[PDB]
């Protein structure tokens, strides 16, 4: 039971987030002023979360564009579940999840397409003992609760575009080249659970 996410908050640089409710589209732009981050206004306790996403065109080296759940962005003891595109390679996506601030569960998935070629569908199914990530209707990763932590705090839905080139000496997302700015990441038909908003 899903519904469109129409009520959002923008955490910084609102001049780089657009929302067109009539087209069910939210855009994030990265350029010399940085990027931006949107989120739901409510947290949720489990459920299915989805969006169509078309990633930015051109040489996206250095950038991270994403969609994720987190209990609170910036909290050092967060729970979170992520899809993160690594801009040096638009034919992969990274998944990860955090439990009381501990991540280190990265996995790299080959998309089979360029994530900027059009809209593709990304889904996170979050339950108390099972998390699944889906791309274009196919499960790409499943994980189960196992005593070494599981995301359980209520979480917001978030998405951002940011320059991650400073992380790990550029090895994670690449150096930021910037030659094709502005970089525009499009989120369409963002859906959140009907019954699980908390509060
Ligand atoms: O200059 C304007 C404004 O900038 C503020 O700082 C920004 C900063 O520029 C930006 O790079 C940083 O980006 C965040 C990003 O929004 C967020 O989504 C991402 O979250 C990670 C998360 O931390 C991980 O654990 C995980 O789950 O993956 C997600 C997604 O990648 O983290 C990055 C890096 O922090 O956001 C800053 C704001 O929070 C200044 O604070 C402000 O003063 C300036 O006005
Ligand atoms: O710097 C923040 C980043 O660190 C990386 O190691 C993690 O894979 C990401 O999930 C996270 O966004």
Coordinates of C-alpha atoms and ligand atoms in Angstrom, one line a residue:
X1 CA 0.0 0.0 0.0
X2 CA 1.9 3.0 -1.4
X3 CA 1.3 6.7 -2.0
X4 CA 3.1 9.5 -3.6
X5 CA 5.5 11.5 -1.5
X6 CA 4.4 15.1 -2.0
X7 CA 5.4 16.7 1.3
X8 CA 9.1 17.1 1.3
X9 CA 11.7 19.1 3.2
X10 CA 14.9 20.4 1.7
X11 CA 17.9 20.3 4.1
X12 CA 20.2 22.8 2.4
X13 CA 20.5 24.9 -0.8
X14 CA 16.8 25.0 -1.8
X15 CA 17.9 26.8 -5.0
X16 CA 19.3 23.4 -6.2
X17 CA 16.2 21.3 -5.5
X18 CA 13.1 21.6 -7.7
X19 CA 9.7 20.0 -7.2
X20 CA 7.1 19.8 -9.9
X21 CA 4.1 18.1 -8.2
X22 CA 2.1 18.1 -11.5
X23 CA 4.8 15.8 -13.0
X24 CA 5.5 14.0 -9.8
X25 CA 9.2 15.0 -10.3
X26 CA 11.9 16.2 -7.9
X27 CA 15.2 17.3 -9.3
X28 CA 18.5 17.8 -7.5
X29 CA 21.3 19.9 -9.2
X30 CA 25.0 19.8 -8.6
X31 CA 27.3 22.5 -9.8
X32 CA 29.8 25.0 -8.4
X33 CA 27.4 25.9 -5.5
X34 CA 27.4 22.3 -4.4
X35 CA 24.3 20.1 -4.4
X36 CA 21.2 19.6 -2.2
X37 CA 19.3 17.0 -0.2
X38 CA 15.5 16.4 0.0
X39 CA 13.7 14.2 2.5
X40 CA 10.3 13.1 3.7
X41 CA 8.8 15.2 6.5
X42 CA 7.9 12.1 8.5
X43 CA 9.8 9.1 9.5
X44 CA 8.5 5.6 8.8
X45 CA 8.6 2.3 10.7
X46 CA 9.3 -0.3 7.9
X47 CA 7.7 -0.5 4.5
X48 CA 8.4 -0.3 0.8
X49 CA 10.0 2.9 -0.7
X50 CA 10.5 3.5 -4.4
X51 CA 11.5 6.0 -7.0
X52 CA 12.2 6.3 -10.7
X53 CA 15.6 7.9 -11.0
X54 CA 17.5 9.3 -14.0
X55 CA 21.0 10.1 -12.9
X56 CA 23.0 13.1 -14.3
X57 CA 24.4 13.2 -17.7
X58 CA 28.1 13.4 -18.7
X59 CA 31.2 12.9 -16.7
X60 CA 29.9 12.5 -13.1
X61 CA 33.3 11.5 -11.6
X62 CA 33.5 12.5 -8.0
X63 CA 29.8 12.8 -7.4
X64 CA 27.5 10.6 -5.2
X65 CA 23.8 10.7 -6.1
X66 CA 21.6 8.4 -4.1
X67 CA 18.3 7.5 -2.5
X68 CA 18.3 6.1 1.1
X69 CA 16.6 5.7 4.4
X70 CA 18.2 7.1 7.5
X71 CA 17.0 7.7 11.1
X72 CA 18.7 11.2 11.0
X73 CA 21.2 12.5 8.5
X74 CA 24.3 13.7 10.4
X75 CA 23.6 11.5 13.5
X76 CA 26.6 9.3 14.3
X77 CA 24.5 6.5 15.7
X78 CA 22.1 6.2 12.7
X79 CA 20.3 3.4 11.2
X80 CA 20.2 3.6 7.4
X81 CA 19.7 1.7 4.1
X82 CA 21.3 3.0 0.9
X83 CA 21.5 3.0 -2.8
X84 CA 24.5 5.2 -3.7
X85 CA 25.7 5.8 -7.3
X86 CA 29.5 6.3 -7.5
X87 CA 30.0 8.9 -10.2
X88 CA 33.2 7.5 -11.8
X89 CA 31.2 4.4 -13.0
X90 CA 27.5 4.9 -14.0
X91 CA 27.1 1.1 -14.7
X92 CA 27.2 0.2 -11.0
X93 CA 25.4 1.1 -7.8
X94 CA 26.5 0.5 -4.3
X95 CA 24.2 -0.8 -1.6
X96 CA 24.9 -0.6 2.2
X97 CA 23.2 -0.4 5.5
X98 CA 24.0 1.1 8.9
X99 CA 23.1 -0.1 12.4
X100 CA 23.7 2.2 15.3
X101 CA 26.3 4.1 13.3
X102 CA 28.2 1.0 12.0
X103 CA 28.1 0.4 8.2
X104 CA 30.8 -1.5 6.4
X105 CA 28.3 -3.6 4.5
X106 CA 29.0 -2.2 1.0
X107 CA 28.2 -4.3 -2.1
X108 CA 28.7 -3.3 -5.7
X109 CA 26.1 -4.3 -8.3
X110 CA 26.4 -4.2 -12.0
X111 CA 23.4 -2.4 -13.4
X112 CA 23.5 -3.7 -17.0
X113 CA 22.7 -0.1 -18.1
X114 CA 24.0 3.4 -17.7
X115 CA 22.0 5.0 -14.8
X116 CA 21.7 8.3 -16.8
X117 CA 20.1 6.7 -19.9
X118 CA 16.5 7.2 -18.8
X119 CA 14.5 6.5 -15.7
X120 CA 14.9 3.2 -13.9
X121 CA 13.0 2.0 -10.9
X122 CA 14.8 1.6 -7.5
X123 CA 13.0 0.0 -4.5
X124 CA 13.9 -0.6 -0.9
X125 CA 11.8 -3.1 1.0
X126 CA 12.5 -2.6 4.7
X127 CA 11.1 -5.1 7.2
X128 CA 12.1 -6.0 10.8
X129 CA 14.1 -9.0 9.7
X130 CA 14.5 -8.7 5.9
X131 CA 15.7 -5.9 3.6
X132 CA 15.6 -6.2 -0.1
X133 CA 16.9 -3.8 -2.8
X134 CA 15.2 -4.0 -6.3
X135 CA 16.2 -2.5 -9.6
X136 CA 13.8 -2.6 -12.5
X137 CA 11.7 -5.1 -10.6
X138 CA 14.5 -7.6 -9.8
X139 CA 15.8 -8.3 -6.4
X140 CA 19.6 -7.4 -6.5
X141 CA 20.3 -8.0 -2.8
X142 CA 18.6 -9.4 0.3
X143 CA 19.8 -9.3 3.8
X144 CA 18.3 -10.8 7.0
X145 CA 18.5 -9.8 10.7
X146 CA 21.2 -11.8 12.5
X147 CA 22.4 -10.4 15.8
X148 CA 25.1 -8.2 14.2
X149 CA 22.7 -5.3 13.9
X150 CA 19.6 -4.5 11.8
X151 CA 18.0 -1.2 10.9
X152 CA 15.1 -0.7 13.3
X153 CA 14.8 3.0 14.2
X154 CA 12.2 5.0 12.4
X155 CA 13.7 6.5 9.2
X156 CA 13.2 9.3 6.8
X157 CA 13.5 8.8 3.1
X158 CA 16.3 11.0 1.8
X159 CA 18.1 11.8 -1.5
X160 CA 21.1 14.0 -2.3
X161 CA 23.7 14.8 -4.8
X162 CA 27.1 15.6 -3.2
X163 CA 30.8 15.8 -4.1
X164 CA 32.3 12.7 -2.4
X165 CA 35.7 13.1 -4.3
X166 CA 37.5 13.9 -1.0
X167 CA 36.6 10.5 0.5
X168 CA 39.4 7.8 0.3
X169 CA 41.6 10.1 -1.8
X170 CA 39.1 10.0 -4.7
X171 CA 39.1 6.2 -4.9
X172 CA 35.4 5.8 -3.9
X173 CA 33.7 8.1 -6.4
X174 CA 36.6 9.4 -8.4
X175 CA 38.1 12.9 -8.7
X176 CA 35.6 15.7 -9.3
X177 CA 36.1 16.8 -12.9
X178 CA 33.0 19.0 -13.2
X179 CA 33.1 19.5 -17.0
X180 CA 29.5 18.7 -17.6
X181 CA 27.9 20.8 -14.8
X182 CA 25.1 21.4 -14.1
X183 CA 24.5 17.8 -13.1
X184 CA 20.8 17.1 -12.8
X185 CA 19.4 14.0 -11.0
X186 CA 15.7 13.4 -11.6
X187 CA 13.5 11.5 -9.1
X188 CA 10.0 10.7 -10.4
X189 CA 7.0 8.9 -8.8
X190 CA 8.6 8.7 -5.4
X191 CA 6.4 6.4 -3.3
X192 CA 6.3 5.8 0.4
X193 CA 4.2 3.5 2.6
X194 CA 0.6 4.5 3.4
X195 CA 0.4 2.9 6.9
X196 CA 3.8 3.1 8.5
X197 CA 4.5 6.8 9.0
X198 CA 5.2 7.5 12.7
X199 CA 4.8 10.4 15.1
Ligands
LIG1 O1 27.3 24.9 1.0 C1 25.9 24.8 1.3 C2 25.7 24.1 2.6 O2 26.5 22.8 2.6 C3 26.3 22.1 3.9 O3 27.1 21.0 3.8 C4 26.6 19.9 3.0 C5 27.8 19.4 2.1 O4 28.1 20.4 1.2 C6 27.4 18.1 1.4 O5 28.5 17.6 0.7 C7 26.9 17.1 2.4 O6 26.5 16.0 1.7 C8 25.9 14.9 2.5 C9 24.7 14.5 1.8 O7 23.7 15.5 1.7 C10 24.1 13.3 2.5 O8 23.0 12.8 1.8 C11 25.1 12.2 2.6 O9 24.5 11.1 3.4 C12 25.2 9.9 3.3 C13 25.3 9.4 4.8 O10 26.0 10.3 5.6 C14 26.0 8.0 4.8 O11 26.1 7.5 6.1 C15 25.1 7.2 3.9 O12 23.9 6.7 4.4 O13 25.0 7.6 2.6 C16 24.4 8.9 2.5 C17 24.3 9.3 1.1 O14 25.5 9.3 0.4 O15 26.3 12.7 3.4 C18 26.9 13.7 2.6 C19 28.2 14.1 3.4 O16 27.9 14.6 4.6 O17 25.8 17.6 3.1 C20 26.2 18.8 3.9 C21 25.0 19.1 4.8 O18 24.6 18.0 5.6 C22 26.8 23.0 5.0 O19 26.5 22.3 6.2 C23 26.0 24.3 5.0 O20 26.6 25.1 6.1 C24 26.1 24.9 3.7 O21 25.2 26.1 3.7
LIG2 O1 31.6 9.2 3.6 C1 30.3 8.6 3.6 C2 30.3 7.3 2.9 O2 31.4 6.4 3.3 C3 31.5 5.1 2.5 O3 32.4 4.4 3.0 C4 30.1 4.4 2.6 O4 30.1 3.4 1.7 C5 28.9 5.2 2.3 O5 27.7 4.3 2.5 C6 28.9 6.6 2.9 O6 28.0 7.5 2.3

